[PDB]
PDB file of C-alpha atoms and ligand atoms in Angstrom:
ATOM      1  CA  UNK A   1      50.244   3.122 -17.522  1.00  0.00           C
ATOM      2  CA  UNK A   2      47.780   0.290 -18.069  1.00  0.00           C
ATOM      3  CA  UNK A   3      48.580  -1.846 -21.105  1.00  0.00           C
ATOM      4  CA  UNK A   4      45.730  -3.689 -22.519  1.00  0.00           C
ATOM      5  CA  UNK A   5      46.142  -6.453 -24.938  1.00  0.00           C
ATOM      6  CA  UNK A   6      43.622  -6.558 -27.739  1.00  0.00           C
ATOM      7  CA  UNK A   7      43.363  -9.746 -29.880  1.00  0.00           C
ATOM      8  CA  UNK A   8      42.789  -8.908 -33.363  1.00  0.00           C
ATOM      9  CA  UNK A   9      42.534 -10.951 -36.517  1.00  0.00           C
ATOM     10  CA  UNK A  10      43.752 -14.541 -35.987  1.00  0.00           C
ATOM     11  CA  UNK A  11      46.820 -13.854 -33.790  1.00  0.00           C
ATOM     12  CA  UNK A  12      47.691 -10.218 -33.940  1.00  0.00           C
ATOM     13  CA  UNK A  13      47.920  -8.131 -30.737  1.00  0.00           C
ATOM     14  CA  UNK A  14      46.918  -4.612 -30.585  1.00  0.00           C
ATOM     15  CA  UNK A  15      47.756  -2.598 -27.446  1.00  0.00           C
ATOM     16  CA  UNK A  16      45.398  -0.059 -25.727  1.00  0.00           C
ATOM     17  CA  UNK A  17      47.532   2.193 -23.526  1.00  0.00           C
ATOM     18  CA  UNK A  18      45.724   3.968 -20.820  1.00  0.00           C
ATOM     19  CA  UNK A  19      47.396   6.751 -18.843  1.00  0.00           C
ATOM     20  CA  UNK A  20      46.364   6.882 -15.234  1.00  0.00           C
ATOM     21  CA  UNK A  21      46.649  10.608 -14.520  1.00  0.00           C
ATOM     22  CA  UNK A  22      44.915  11.868 -17.586  1.00  0.00           C
ATOM     23  CA  UNK A  23      42.755   9.283 -19.352  1.00  0.00           C
ATOM     24  CA  UNK A  24      44.762   9.897 -22.551  1.00  0.00           C
ATOM     25  CA  UNK A  25      44.472   6.600 -24.493  1.00  0.00           C
ATOM     26  CA  UNK A  26      46.674   5.290 -27.273  1.00  0.00           C
ATOM     27  CA  UNK A  27      46.451   2.269 -29.442  1.00  0.00           C
ATOM     28  CA  UNK A  28      49.638   0.421 -30.822  1.00  0.00           C
ATOM     29  CA  UNK A  29      49.095  -1.552 -34.096  1.00  0.00           C
ATOM     30  CA  UNK A  30      45.315  -1.456 -34.536  1.00  0.00           C
ATOM     31  CA  UNK A  31      44.829  -4.362 -36.977  1.00  0.00           C
ATOM     32  CA  UNK A  32      41.181  -3.580 -37.457  1.00  0.00           C
ATOM     33  CA  UNK A  33      39.153  -0.755 -35.937  1.00  0.00           C
ATOM     34  CA  UNK A  34      36.186  -2.774 -34.603  1.00  0.00           C
ATOM     35  CA  UNK A  35      37.992  -4.653 -31.576  1.00  0.00           C
ATOM     36  CA  UNK A  36      39.531  -1.410 -30.503  1.00  0.00           C
ATOM     37  CA  UNK A  37      36.219   0.490 -30.730  1.00  0.00           C
ATOM     38  CA  UNK A  38      34.698  -2.421 -28.720  1.00  0.00           C
ATOM     39  CA  UNK A  39      37.285  -1.951 -25.934  1.00  0.00           C
ATOM     40  CA  UNK A  40      37.053   1.684 -25.721  1.00  0.00           C
ATOM     41  CA  UNK A  41      33.183   1.792 -25.517  1.00  0.00           C
ATOM     42  CA  UNK A  42      33.647  -0.479 -22.490  1.00  0.00           C
ATOM     43  CA  UNK A  43      36.188   1.755 -20.805  1.00  0.00           C
ATOM     44  CA  UNK A  44      34.047   4.682 -21.888  1.00  0.00           C
ATOM     45  CA  UNK A  45      37.112   6.564 -23.307  1.00  0.00           C
ATOM     46  CA  UNK A  46      37.946   8.393 -26.716  1.00  0.00           C
ATOM     47  CA  UNK A  47      41.177   7.538 -28.712  1.00  0.00           C
ATOM     48  CA  UNK A  48      43.902  10.053 -28.584  1.00  0.00           C
ATOM     49  CA  UNK A  49      46.823   8.454 -30.382  1.00  0.00           C
ATOM     50  CA  UNK A  50      47.481   5.640 -32.922  1.00  0.00           C
ATOM     51  CA  UNK A  51      51.119   4.360 -32.907  1.00  0.00           C
ATOM     52  CA  UNK A  52      52.401   1.833 -35.667  1.00  0.00           C
ATOM     53  CA  UNK A  53      55.448  -0.194 -35.503  1.00  0.00           C
ATOM     54  CA  UNK A  54      55.511  -0.943 -39.157  1.00  0.00           C
ATOM     55  CA  UNK A  55      53.251  -0.718 -42.273  1.00  0.00           C
ATOM     56  CA  UNK A  56      51.944  -4.222 -42.827  1.00  0.00           C
ATOM     57  CA  UNK A  57      48.210  -4.289 -43.215  1.00  0.00           C
ATOM     58  CA  UNK A  58      47.892  -6.330 -40.061  1.00  0.00           C
ATOM     59  CA  UNK A  59      49.288  -3.536 -38.054  1.00  0.00           C
ATOM     60  CA  UNK A  60      47.730  -0.433 -39.818  1.00  0.00           C
ATOM     61  CA  UNK A  61      44.432  -1.773 -41.117  1.00  0.00           C
ATOM     62  CA  UNK A  62      42.279   0.117 -38.462  1.00  0.00           C
ATOM     63  CA  UNK A  63      44.280   3.462 -38.657  1.00  0.00           C
ATOM     64  CA  UNK A  64      42.012   5.412 -40.983  1.00  0.00           C
ATOM     65  CA  UNK A  65      38.736   4.425 -39.540  1.00  0.00           C
ATOM     66  CA  UNK A  66      39.905   5.072 -35.912  1.00  0.00           C
ATOM     67  CA  UNK A  67      41.485   8.371 -36.857  1.00  0.00           C
ATOM     68  CA  UNK A  68      38.330   9.514 -38.609  1.00  0.00           C
ATOM     69  CA  UNK A  69      36.010   8.193 -35.876  1.00  0.00           C
ATOM     70  CA  UNK A  70      37.909   9.655 -32.889  1.00  0.00           C
ATOM     71  CA  UNK A  71      40.076  12.466 -34.428  1.00  0.00           C
ATOM     72  CA  UNK A  72      43.087  10.515 -33.091  1.00  0.00           C
ATOM     73  CA  UNK A  73      46.502  11.469 -34.221  1.00  0.00           C
ATOM     74  CA  UNK A  74      48.649   8.800 -36.059  1.00  0.00           C
ATOM     75  CA  UNK A  75      52.311   8.425 -34.796  1.00  0.00           C
ATOM     76  CA  UNK A  76      54.719   6.455 -36.946  1.00  0.00           C
ATOM     77  CA  UNK A  77      58.132   6.095 -38.447  1.00  0.00           C
ATOM     78  CA  UNK A  78      59.742   8.898 -40.558  1.00  0.00           C
ATOM     79  CA  UNK A  79      61.418   6.148 -42.709  1.00  0.00           C
ATOM     80  CA  UNK A  80      57.859   4.930 -43.577  1.00  0.00           C
ATOM     81  CA  UNK A  81      55.976   8.203 -43.784  1.00  0.00           C
ATOM     82  CA  UNK A  82      54.536   7.413 -47.253  1.00  0.00           C
ATOM     83  CA  UNK A  83      53.363   3.898 -46.006  1.00  0.00           C
ATOM     84  CA  UNK A  84      51.687   4.451 -42.605  1.00  0.00           C
ATOM     85  CA  UNK A  85      48.122   5.439 -43.349  1.00  0.00           C
ATOM     86  CA  UNK A  86      47.014   8.742 -41.835  1.00  0.00           C
ATOM     87  CA  UNK A  87      50.272   9.539 -40.233  1.00  0.00           C
ATOM     88  CA  UNK A  88      50.307  12.865 -38.507  1.00  0.00           C
ATOM     89  CA  UNK A  89      53.671  12.717 -36.766  1.00  0.00           C
ATOM     90  CA  UNK A  90      56.899  10.957 -38.182  1.00  0.00           C
ATOM     91  CA  UNK A  91      59.393   9.835 -35.813  1.00  0.00           C
ATOM     92  CA  UNK A  92      63.212   9.090 -36.109  1.00  0.00           C
ATOM     93  CA  UNK A  93      65.595   6.862 -34.400  1.00  0.00           C
ATOM     94  CA  UNK A  94      66.401   8.105 -30.807  1.00  0.00           C
ATOM     95  CA  UNK A  95      63.475  10.563 -30.855  1.00  0.00           C
ATOM     96  CA  UNK A  96      61.691  11.022 -27.497  1.00  0.00           C
ATOM     97  CA  UNK A  97      57.938  11.346 -27.853  1.00  0.00           C
ATOM     98  CA  UNK A  98      55.579  12.264 -24.844  1.00  0.00           C
ATOM     99  CA  UNK A  99      52.476  10.063 -24.306  1.00  0.00           C
ATOM    100  CA  UNK A 100      50.757  12.364 -21.756  1.00  0.00           C
ATOM    101  CA  UNK A 101      54.045  13.222 -20.080  1.00  0.00           C
ATOM    102  CA  UNK A 102      55.502   9.621 -20.249  1.00  0.00           C
ATOM    103  CA  UNK A 103      58.595   9.242 -22.349  1.00  0.00           C
ATOM    104  CA  UNK A 104      58.641   7.041 -25.423  1.00  0.00           C
ATOM    105  CA  UNK A 105      61.997   6.337 -26.866  1.00  0.00           C
ATOM    106  CA  UNK A 106      61.797   5.472 -30.486  1.00  0.00           C
ATOM    107  CA  UNK A 107      64.236   2.755 -31.850  1.00  0.00           C
ATOM    108  CA  UNK A 108      64.711   1.934 -35.577  1.00  0.00           C
ATOM    109  CA  UNK A 109      64.475  -1.789 -35.678  1.00  0.00           C
ATOM    110  CA  UNK A 110      64.775  -2.849 -39.463  1.00  0.00           C
ATOM    111  CA  UNK A 111      64.890  -6.549 -40.459  1.00  0.00           C
ATOM    112  CA  UNK A 112      61.158  -7.550 -40.987  1.00  0.00           C
ATOM    113  CA  UNK A 113      60.725  -4.434 -42.818  1.00  0.00           C
ATOM    114  CA  UNK A 114      62.863  -1.510 -43.566  1.00  0.00           C
ATOM    115  CA  UNK A 115      61.118   1.234 -41.629  1.00  0.00           C
ATOM    116  CA  UNK A 116      60.087  -0.873 -38.632  1.00  0.00           C
ATOM    117  CA  UNK A 117      60.331   0.916 -35.196  1.00  0.00           C
ATOM    118  CA  UNK A 118      60.030  -0.268 -31.664  1.00  0.00           C
ATOM    119  CA  UNK A 119      58.625   1.835 -28.829  1.00  0.00           C
ATOM    120  CA  UNK A 120      60.312   1.828 -25.522  1.00  0.00           C
ATOM    121  CA  UNK A 121      58.419   3.326 -22.391  1.00  0.00           C
ATOM    122  CA  UNK A 122      61.149   3.289 -19.872  1.00  0.00           C
ATOM    123  CA  UNK A 123      58.584   4.399 -17.038  1.00  0.00           C
ATOM    124  CA  UNK A 124      56.577   1.303 -17.600  1.00  0.00           C
ATOM    125  CA  UNK A 125      59.643  -0.943 -18.275  1.00  0.00           C
ATOM    126  CA  UNK A 126      57.827  -1.887 -21.364  1.00  0.00           C
ATOM    127  CA  UNK A 127      58.787  -2.218 -25.089  1.00  0.00           C
ATOM    128  CA  UNK A 128      56.430  -2.688 -28.165  1.00  0.00           C
ATOM    129  CA  UNK A 129      58.473  -4.667 -30.654  1.00  0.00           C
ATOM    130  CA  UNK A 130      55.849  -5.154 -33.364  1.00  0.00           C
ATOM    131  CA  UNK A 131      57.202  -8.030 -35.630  1.00  0.00           C
ATOM    132  CA  UNK A 132      60.896  -7.631 -34.925  1.00  0.00           C
ATOM    133  CA  UNK A 133      61.054  -9.944 -31.775  1.00  0.00           C
ATOM    134  CA  UNK A 134      58.296 -12.365 -30.781  1.00  0.00           C
ATOM    135  CA  UNK A 135      58.524 -14.692 -27.850  1.00  0.00           C
ATOM    136  CA  UNK A 136      61.018 -17.294 -29.121  1.00  0.00           C
ATOM    137  CA  UNK A 137      61.331 -16.044 -32.507  1.00  0.00           C
ATOM    138  CA  UNK A 138      61.908 -12.912 -34.716  1.00  0.00           C
ATOM    139  CA  UNK A 139      59.900 -11.596 -37.785  1.00  0.00           C
ATOM    140  CA  UNK A 140      60.464 -13.152 -41.157  1.00  0.00           C
ATOM    141  CA  UNK A 141      62.893 -10.932 -43.053  1.00  0.00           C
ATOM    142  CA  UNK A 142      60.649  -9.535 -45.892  1.00  0.00           C
ATOM    143  CA  UNK A 143      62.643  -6.386 -46.513  1.00  0.00           C
ATOM    144  CA  UNK A 144      65.819  -6.380 -44.305  1.00  0.00           C
ATOM    145  CA  UNK A 145      68.871  -8.425 -43.809  1.00  0.00           C
ATOM    146  CA  UNK A 146      70.095 -10.900 -41.242  1.00  0.00           C
ATOM    147  CA  UNK A 147      72.571  -8.337 -40.142  1.00  0.00           C
ATOM    148  CA  UNK A 148      69.925  -5.662 -39.715  1.00  0.00           C
ATOM    149  CA  UNK A 149      67.683  -7.994 -37.653  1.00  0.00           C
ATOM    150  CA  UNK A 150      70.550  -9.049 -35.396  1.00  0.00           C
ATOM    151  CA  UNK A 151      71.446  -5.532 -34.641  1.00  0.00           C
ATOM    152  CA  UNK A 152      67.648  -4.616 -33.941  1.00  0.00           C
ATOM    153  CA  UNK A 153      67.362  -7.647 -31.725  1.00  0.00           C
ATOM    154  CA  UNK A 154      70.540  -6.697 -29.876  1.00  0.00           C
ATOM    155  CA  UNK A 155      69.195  -2.997 -29.337  1.00  0.00           C
ATOM    156  CA  UNK A 156      66.064  -4.600 -27.642  1.00  0.00           C
ATOM    157  CA  UNK A 157      68.261  -6.930 -25.642  1.00  0.00           C
ATOM    158  CA  UNK A 158      70.522  -4.151 -24.357  1.00  0.00           C
ATOM    159  CA  UNK A 159      67.495  -2.981 -22.458  1.00  0.00           C
ATOM    160  CA  UNK A 160      67.212  -4.111 -18.768  1.00  0.00           C
ATOM    161  CA  UNK A 161      66.337  -7.659 -18.255  1.00  0.00           C
ATOM    162  CA  UNK A 162      63.255  -6.803 -16.442  1.00  0.00           C
ATOM    163  CA  UNK A 163      61.773  -5.155 -19.476  1.00  0.00           C
ATOM    164  CA  UNK A 164      58.463  -6.618 -20.684  1.00  0.00           C
ATOM    165  CA  UNK A 165      58.199  -7.139 -24.384  1.00  0.00           C
ATOM    166  CA  UNK A 166      54.822  -6.657 -26.065  1.00  0.00           C
ATOM    167  CA  UNK A 167      55.051  -8.174 -29.549  1.00  0.00           C
ATOM    168  CA  UNK A 168      52.819  -8.183 -32.656  1.00  0.00           C
ATOM    169  CA  UNK A 169      51.537 -11.810 -32.687  1.00  0.00           C
ATOM    170  CA  UNK A 170      50.727 -14.723 -30.608  1.00  0.00           C
ATOM    171  CA  UNK A 171      53.261 -17.244 -32.034  1.00  0.00           C
ATOM    172  CA  UNK A 172      54.907 -18.520 -28.996  1.00  0.00           C
ATOM    173  CA  UNK A 173      53.510 -21.933 -28.991  1.00  0.00           C
ATOM    174  CA  UNK A 174      54.669 -22.703 -32.568  1.00  0.00           C
ATOM    175  CA  UNK A 175      57.885 -20.972 -31.947  1.00  0.00           C
ATOM    176  CA  UNK A 176      58.616 -23.078 -28.962  1.00  0.00           C
ATOM    177  CA  UNK A 177      58.396 -26.305 -30.985  1.00  0.00           C
ATOM    178  CA  UNK A 178      61.078 -25.004 -33.447  1.00  0.00           C
ATOM    179  CA  UNK A 179      63.181 -23.761 -30.496  1.00  0.00           C
ATOM    180  CA  UNK A 180      63.006 -27.246 -28.721  1.00  0.00           C
ATOM    181  CA  UNK A 181      64.063 -28.950 -32.027  1.00  0.00           C
ATOM    182  CA  UNK A 182      67.354 -26.897 -31.723  1.00  0.00           C
ATOM    183  CA  UNK A 183      68.005 -26.650 -28.069  1.00  0.00           C
ATOM    184  CA  UNK A 184      66.333 -29.497 -26.253  1.00  0.00           C
ATOM    185  CA  UNK A 185      68.678 -29.569 -23.356  1.00  0.00           C
ATOM    186  CA  UNK A 186      67.841 -26.011 -22.339  1.00  0.00           C
ATOM    187  CA  UNK A 187      65.772 -26.369 -19.245  1.00  0.00           C
ATOM    188  CA  UNK A 188      64.715 -22.850 -19.006  1.00  0.00           C
ATOM    189  CA  UNK A 189      63.296 -23.365 -22.491  1.00  0.00           C
ATOM    190  CA  UNK A 190      61.774 -26.619 -21.418  1.00  0.00           C
ATOM    191  CA  UNK A 191      59.969 -24.997 -18.521  1.00  0.00           C
ATOM    192  CA  UNK A 192      58.837 -22.004 -20.515  1.00  0.00           C
ATOM    193  CA  UNK A 193      57.625 -24.122 -23.358  1.00  0.00           C
ATOM    194  CA  UNK A 194      55.490 -26.125 -21.032  1.00  0.00           C
ATOM    195  CA  UNK A 195      53.976 -23.104 -19.401  1.00  0.00           C
ATOM    196  CA  UNK A 196      53.230 -21.665 -22.878  1.00  0.00           C
ATOM    197  CA  UNK A 197      51.380 -24.929 -23.798  1.00  0.00           C
ATOM    198  CA  UNK A 198      49.399 -24.569 -20.516  1.00  0.00           C
ATOM    199  CA  UNK A 199      48.426 -21.023 -21.342  1.00  0.00           C
ATOM    200  CA  UNK A 200      47.508 -21.780 -24.854  1.00  0.00           C
ATOM    201  CA  UNK A 201      45.459 -24.809 -23.848  1.00  0.00           C
ATOM    202  CA  UNK A 202      43.294 -22.309 -21.917  1.00  0.00           C
ATOM    203  CA  UNK A 203      43.188 -19.727 -24.673  1.00  0.00           C
ATOM    204  CA  UNK A 204      45.354 -17.071 -22.775  1.00  0.00           C
ATOM    205  CA  UNK A 205      48.067 -14.976 -24.186  1.00  0.00           C
ATOM    206  CA  UNK A 206      51.647 -15.781 -23.591  1.00  0.00           C
ATOM    207  CA  UNK A 207      52.512 -11.970 -24.068  1.00  0.00           C
ATOM    208  CA  UNK A 208      54.300 -10.033 -22.561  1.00  0.00           C
ATOM    209  CA  UNK A 209      57.550 -11.820 -22.439  1.00  0.00           C
ATOM    210  CA  UNK A 210      60.701 -10.338 -20.900  1.00  0.00           C
ATOM    211  CA  UNK A 211      64.199  -9.498 -22.062  1.00  0.00           C
ATOM    212  CA  UNK A 212      65.495 -11.989 -19.440  1.00  0.00           C
ATOM    213  CA  UNK A 213      63.321 -14.777 -20.825  1.00  0.00           C
ATOM    214  CA  UNK A 214      64.043 -14.257 -24.295  1.00  0.00           C
ATOM    215  CA  UNK A 215      67.773 -14.155 -23.834  1.00  0.00           C
ATOM    216  CA  UNK A 216      67.572 -17.385 -21.991  1.00  0.00           C
ATOM    217  CA  UNK A 217      65.285 -19.142 -24.612  1.00  0.00           C
ATOM    218  CA  UNK A 218      64.902 -17.484 -27.990  1.00  0.00           C
ATOM    219  CA  UNK A 219      67.192 -19.123 -30.654  1.00  0.00           C
ATOM    220  CA  UNK A 220      67.574 -15.837 -32.502  1.00  0.00           C
ATOM    221  CA  UNK A 221      69.293 -14.428 -29.401  1.00  0.00           C
ATOM    222  CA  UNK A 222      71.294 -17.530 -28.914  1.00  0.00           C
ATOM    223  CA  UNK A 223      72.977 -18.104 -32.421  1.00  0.00           C
ATOM    224  CA  UNK A 224      76.400 -18.862 -30.916  1.00  0.00           C
ATOM    225  CA  UNK A 225      75.034 -21.603 -28.902  1.00  0.00           C
ATOM    226  CA  UNK A 226      76.977 -24.791 -29.693  1.00  0.00           C
ATOM    227  CA  UNK A 227      73.862 -27.088 -29.769  1.00  0.00           C
ATOM    228  CA  UNK A 228      71.789 -24.812 -31.973  1.00  0.00           C
ATOM    229  CA  UNK A 229      74.793 -24.471 -34.510  1.00  0.00           C
ATOM    230  CA  UNK A 230      75.261 -28.181 -34.425  1.00  0.00           C
ATOM    231  CA  UNK A 231      71.626 -29.021 -35.021  1.00  0.00           C
ATOM    232  CA  UNK A 232      71.812 -26.636 -38.178  1.00  0.00           C
ATOM    233  CA  UNK A 233      75.321 -27.320 -39.299  1.00  0.00           C
ATOM    234  CA  UNK A 234      76.243 -23.760 -38.836  1.00  0.00           C
ATOM    235  CA  UNK A 235      79.833 -23.534 -39.049  1.00  0.00           C
ATOM    236  CA  UNK A 236      81.834 -22.477 -35.946  1.00  0.00           C
ATOM    237  CA  UNK A 237      83.337 -19.793 -38.046  1.00  0.00           C
ATOM    238  CA  UNK A 238      80.083 -18.118 -38.967  1.00  0.00           C
ATOM    239  CA  UNK A 239      79.503 -14.902 -37.291  1.00  0.00           C
ATOM    240  CA  UNK A 240      76.186 -14.146 -35.351  1.00  0.00           C
ATOM    241  CA  UNK A 241      74.502 -12.557 -38.421  1.00  0.00           C
ATOM    242  CA  UNK A 242      75.273 -15.434 -40.677  1.00  0.00           C
ATOM    243  CA  UNK A 243      74.057 -17.787 -38.027  1.00  0.00           C
ATOM    244  CA  UNK A 244      70.794 -15.786 -37.579  1.00  0.00           C
ATOM    245  CA  UNK A 245      70.139 -16.043 -41.338  1.00  0.00           C
ATOM    246  CA  UNK A 246      70.590 -19.847 -41.348  1.00  0.00           C
ATOM    247  CA  UNK A 247      68.160 -20.223 -38.182  1.00  0.00           C
ATOM    248  CA  UNK A 248      65.675 -17.945 -39.984  1.00  0.00           C
ATOM    249  CA  UNK A 249      65.695 -19.928 -43.108  1.00  0.00           C
ATOM    250  CA  UNK A 250      65.429 -23.158 -41.185  1.00  0.00           C
ATOM    251  CA  UNK A 251      62.450 -21.892 -39.148  1.00  0.00           C
ATOM    252  CA  UNK A 252      60.710 -20.635 -42.422  1.00  0.00           C
ATOM    253  CA  UNK A 253      60.958 -24.234 -43.763  1.00  0.00           C
ATOM    254  CA  UNK A 254      60.127 -26.125 -40.619  1.00  0.00           C
TER     255      UNK A 254
HETATM  256 FE1   FE B   1      52.245  -8.632 -38.211  1.00  0.00          FE
HETATM  257 ZN1   ZN B   2      54.649  -7.409 -40.346  1.00  0.00          ZN
END
């Protein structure tokens, strides 16, 4: 499966999924129809499926136009069925869904919203995490709790280290500045953050990231780290969920 990043809006990523044997095409999180249409006209293909990670307008804004234009089918969360525009098929946690005969494993990943899902394509060693996990951050907790976010992040990080993570936004550079404020002695983070700065200086994406990288660098996955806790005066006795909630509030106000 070829995964094409499609920049939308200011910093969103939609993903056009191209099956190689069939020419079936899907799109993950079409923020707006036009950039998707533009890409499809180039490849000279029709859109089969629209998949949404969560309900926010920046992930669902293009749904109705694309559905009407192409006769595409919208695939989204059963929890969010009344909030996903145009939804044809509603999927539950642990559901398997076939994208032209490639397995998609649906994971409920509440935290940013209640209803957010992530989409794991084991055959492509790829997961679409929406706004649950970014490179070096997690979504703001608009509907869910720190405990829910932690659990969701741990589901993602339980996948193989070589799993590529395709997330909803290009936030990595700003995220890296906050991460370095907390864990400046993390050399893997130092190196990554520099590479990110280089990519962004030439207007290239920092996505996909990987499970391995995020475990090594993302503060939200590293909340028991002594330096991070000391930087934020998080008590040694706090559990990981409490620590995450403190990190998230600090980042919001950074
Ligand atoms: Fe978003
Ligand atoms: Zn969102």
